[PDB]
């Protein structure tokens, strides 16, 4: 029994932490130079926020962020990891002669017991589309250990939404589904499942990158302030949007990316997964409308993206959009846990 | 608590049948023309084995094999599928006007009830390296519904093992693990985990295809006769081997592929995943040694490949190999459930 247990199916949690038990997956994230280098930059350039301070690292993995905190002069660093990677973190702590400064605590942050309050919390709780994995709630839950005057790195998270036009991406869904639209696949009529195949492909968010020229409006930003927010703020995330269309064409869906900021005493450092920036292992995410919407340049595309948390450490995505100047409407319902990885 | 439940962790089963609930995965397997076309050839060309017969289809998926049985003249086909795909299969039975001959029984073959014994069981229980998924045990378990002298389609399965040389593959995987050899990654010494990284990377079987020229000895064959075997026989599979090396060079591991035979009353039809045959979605599987063995043409490479079934619907693979002339020895442990899809 715990906050984490109450909101997570056991079978999903098993798979989740088994994935993170692989050194090859730590390696995958560590080799993202944008990710790793930016975190190091944020921590070292704000050394005054760590010098002689007590630090909590939520989901430390192999422990890299704790080592960066140590490089910045932290007095003691509590590194919490629930996967079997905690085992390998301890090895690195000992081999790096930092047992006196880094204490690895295996287990879920919602279930471990820290001996004292901390001055600052560090973590990388961002999944793709920011909210996937539902680790932001564990990050916010860790604030029970934060001194009232404490900080958090990252301090805020911004998710960005923008309409896009990708005719080929849209038509690709039916090309795949039309496999079932044949009267004699080895003598079998498959056409009765074509509609089910279509619906299946449209429930999948598309994880990949794209040229920024497919965007047709300035993004809408939904900010999460990690210093102010509660866990409950992420169970239901309603993002209203009203896009001012910069280009005329067919809008096939919404594109998602996110930024996080490390607001330190000396400076603020930004880690962005935007399509205008170097690509990261988060890539970007696109959710198609079931039907495109024609929008003239200067029209307004209004609607709501509703993220409903589920017990599979992810969200169900409800998107409703319409062009105000025409009343043309579309929507879609997507399962963020099972996206289509389209990058080549 | 069924036989399936006792040998499978719930977490594995949920993910397992979730994968097969996707129409896109059915499309994936169905579009493998070697696989689907070879099954239709086995069934239709052996139509006398199906005409007016009672059939059991284990893991029918969308039902494609039931339809082949129907085309071959089957009287009644019980098609058992445990994933949600069973609902889609029912739709296809209705839309193809075969409700009088194909009866979808949703559920695990270890748990469902059939109204009568069957003359023949059809199924596709082969995972990659054949044994992955542990569905061969479900296939064998289904024989409780098989009449005396009933047939099995496929009837037998052959696993093939052969040593290979492939420096590129070996250095590809070794290079990945050597990331954890860095003594100063952003100022951090990772070298203490180099051993663990090597272990982790080399217990991943490599799924892809290769040129037959990398093979250094005639393959050893291990046969499972489905008509005879009990599911208990697949809990601990021991495959001794004694290769006679045809070429000199480094042995980086063993390669695996499999053939199944459809021994029907009209003709035997083979479905092979060998590197000499057209490629299938099963590809081939290779298990690397952490350090290769040097062998001379004429030497003998001896050892044992031991497959121990686990509760994640897979096998933990133990390979011990030895160059008899020099005593050079290599042992590896591989996790068949978590391979490296390299194609």
């Amino acid at each position: 029994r715990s906050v984490f247990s109450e909101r997570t199916e056991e079978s999903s949690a098993v798979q989740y932490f088994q994935f993170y038990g692989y050194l090859s997956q730590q390696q995958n994230m560590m080799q993202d130079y944008v990710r790793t280098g930016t975190y190091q930059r944020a921590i070292l350039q704000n050394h005054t926020d760590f010098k002689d301070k007590i630090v909590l690292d939520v989901g430390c993995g192999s422990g890299i962020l704790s080592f960066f905190a140590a490089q910045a002069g932290a007095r003691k660093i509590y590194a919490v990891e629930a996967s079997t990677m905690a085992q390998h973190a301890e090895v690195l702590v000992k081999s790096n002669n930092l047992t006196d400064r880094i204490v690895v605590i295996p287990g879920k942050v919602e279930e471990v017991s820290l001996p004292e309050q901390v001055d600052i919390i560090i973590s990388e709780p961002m999944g793709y589309m920011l909210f996937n994995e539902r680790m932001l709630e564990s990050y916010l839950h860790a604030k029970k250990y934060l001194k009232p005057s404490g900080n958090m790195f990252p301090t805020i998270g911004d998710v960005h939404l923008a309409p896009f036009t990708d005719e080929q991406l849209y038509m690709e869904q039916f090309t795949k589904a039309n496999f079932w639209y044949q009267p004699s696949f080895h003598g079998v009529d498959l056409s009765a499942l074509r509609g089910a195949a279509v619906d299946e492909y449209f429930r999948q968010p598309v994880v990949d990158t794209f040229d920024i020229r497919i965007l047709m409006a300035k993004s809408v930003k939904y900010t999460v302030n990690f210093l102010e927010a509660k866990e409950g703020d992420l169970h239901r995330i309603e993002i209203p949007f009203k896009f001012h269309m910069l280009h005329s064409g067919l809008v096939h869906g919404l594109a998602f990316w996110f930024d996080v900021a490390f607001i330190g005493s000396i400076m603020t450092v930004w880690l962005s997964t935007a399509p205008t920036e170097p690509l990261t292992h988060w890539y970007q995410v696109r959710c198609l409308f079931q039907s495109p919407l024609f929008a003239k340049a200067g029209d307004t595309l209004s609607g709501t993206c509703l993220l409903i948390a589920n017990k599979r450490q992810s969200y169900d995505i409800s998107i409703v959009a319409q062009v105000d100047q025409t009343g043309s409407k579309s929507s879609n319902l997507l399962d963020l846990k099972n996206p289509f990885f389209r990058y080549t | 608590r069924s036989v399936f439940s006792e040998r499978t962790e719930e977490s594995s089963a949920v993910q397992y049948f979730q994968f097969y609930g996707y129409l896109s995965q059915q499309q994936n397997m169905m579009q493998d023309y070697v696989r689907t076309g070879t099954y239709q050839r086995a069934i239709l060309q052996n139509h006398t084995d199906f005409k007016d017969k009672i059939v059991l289809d284990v893991g029918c998926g969308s039902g494609i094999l039931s339809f082949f049985a129907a085309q071959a003249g089957a009287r009644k086909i019980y098609a058992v599928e445990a994933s949600t795909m069973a609902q889609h299969a029912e739709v296809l039975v209705k839309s193809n006007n075969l409700t009088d001959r194909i009866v979808v029984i949703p559920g695990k073959v270890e748990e469902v009830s059939l109204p009568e014994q069957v003359d023949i069981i059809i199924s596709e229980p082969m995972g990659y390296m054949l044994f992955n998924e542990r569905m061969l045990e479900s296939y064998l378990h289904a024989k409780k519904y098989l009449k005396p002298s009933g047939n099995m389609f496929p009837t037998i399965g052959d696993v093939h093992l052969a040593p290979f040389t492939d420096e590129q593959l070996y250095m590809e995987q070794f290079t990945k693990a050597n990331f954890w050899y860095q003594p100063s990654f952003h100022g951090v010494d990772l070298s203490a985990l180099r051993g663990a990284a090597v272990d982790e990377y080399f217990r991943q079987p490599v799924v892809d295809t290769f040129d037959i020229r990398i093979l250094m000895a005639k393959s050893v064959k291990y046969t499972v006769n489905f008509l005879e075997a009990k599911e208990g026989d697949l809990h601990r599979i021991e495959i001794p081997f004694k290769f006679h090396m045809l070429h000199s060079g480094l042995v980086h591991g063993l390669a695996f592929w499999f053939d199944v035979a459809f021994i029907g009353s009209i003709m035997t039809v083979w479905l092979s995943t060998a590197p000499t045959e057209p490629l299938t979605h099963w590809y081939q599987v290779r298990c690397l040694f952490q350090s290769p063995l040097f062998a001379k043409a004429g030497d003998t490479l001896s050892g044992t490949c031991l497959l121990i079934a686990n509760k994640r619907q897979s096998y933990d693979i133990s390979i011990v190999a030895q160059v008899d002339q020099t005593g050079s020895k290599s042992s590896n442990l591989l996790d068949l459930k978590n391979p490296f899809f390299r194609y």
Binding site: F19, M29, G127 | -
Partner: peptide, 8 residues
């Protein structure tokens, strides 16, 4: 397909 974080 069980991949929580995409491959970089």
């Amino acid at each position: 397909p069980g991949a929580i974080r995409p491959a970089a």
